[PDB]
Amino acid sequence: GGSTRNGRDSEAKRLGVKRFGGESVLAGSIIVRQRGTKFHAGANVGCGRDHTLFAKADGKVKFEVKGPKNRKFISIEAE
Amino acid sequence: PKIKTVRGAAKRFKKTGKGGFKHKHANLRHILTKKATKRKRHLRPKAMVSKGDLGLVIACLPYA
Amino acid sequence: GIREKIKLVSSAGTGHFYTTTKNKRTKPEKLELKKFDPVVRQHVIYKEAK
């Protein structure tokens, strides 16, 4: 055998889908590792150490797709 | 007979303005060389129990 | 482990100090490299590192 073990939660995922109330600085999209699974853009960015899509100034969320060969990109428009 | 308070707990909790108990944070008196200076900074200020363990301190500290 | 622990004392008379590690073997010389101790409220050199 010699097989088993396994990591834990590490949740990681979108916690602010579509236009949301978007607090002054909600989470939005954790999904660590992800530098490109979701990209920083607009009135939100940050992209913390663990690539956590920050989310600056409060407001609706966008979720787009632009230049550099598709690319996700998360931005937040004000309500 | 007057209930005996859990001497120990009475040295880690301090009843606040209301129910709240106010307590000290763990991980700030051992192996710190390899710890985030931000982690410790966000550890110095002591700050109360969680209502889920609260009912486990007001039964430990009868005369609080 | 091997990576011994190290303390960086302030060059200033102040007693404040910093803490980190270093490979006592590979690098013989002791680490010196400045920092900022709240006391003097100013940046300054930091010595001592085996």
């Binding site: - | 707990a9 880690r12 700030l28 008196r29 486990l56 301190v57 | -």
Partner: protein, 96 residues
């Protein structure tokens, strides 16, 4: 406190000690009191005999609780600039 087998909580959190040894004698008087001390001069004692402080007590603070009206003179007691205020107006004098 027995939280199953796992280490308790009153055993998981550190302990911050050190106790007064001076607060037990350091009392806290209130505006409501003051003139309630029967007559003038709110002395170090008097309050004690006025069943409002307690023997052992050695020190005490004036502090604002509300009342004051009647002009009074506190003797040998501490007071806040927010209490020494609400008193001199309604008439009064601080020891010192």
């Amino acid at each position: 406190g027995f939280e199953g087998g796992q280490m308790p909580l009153y055993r998981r959190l550190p302990k911050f000690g050190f106790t007064s040894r001076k607060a037990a004698i350091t009392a806290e008087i209130r505006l409501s009191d003051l003139a309630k001390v029967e007559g003038g001069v709110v002395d170090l004692n008097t309050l004690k005999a006025a069943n409002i402080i307690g023997i052992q007590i050695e020190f005490a603070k004036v502090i604002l609780a509300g009342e004051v009206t009647t002009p009074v003179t506190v003797r040998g007691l501490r007071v806040t600039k927010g209490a020494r205020a609400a008193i001199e107006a309604a008439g009064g004098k601080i020891e010192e």
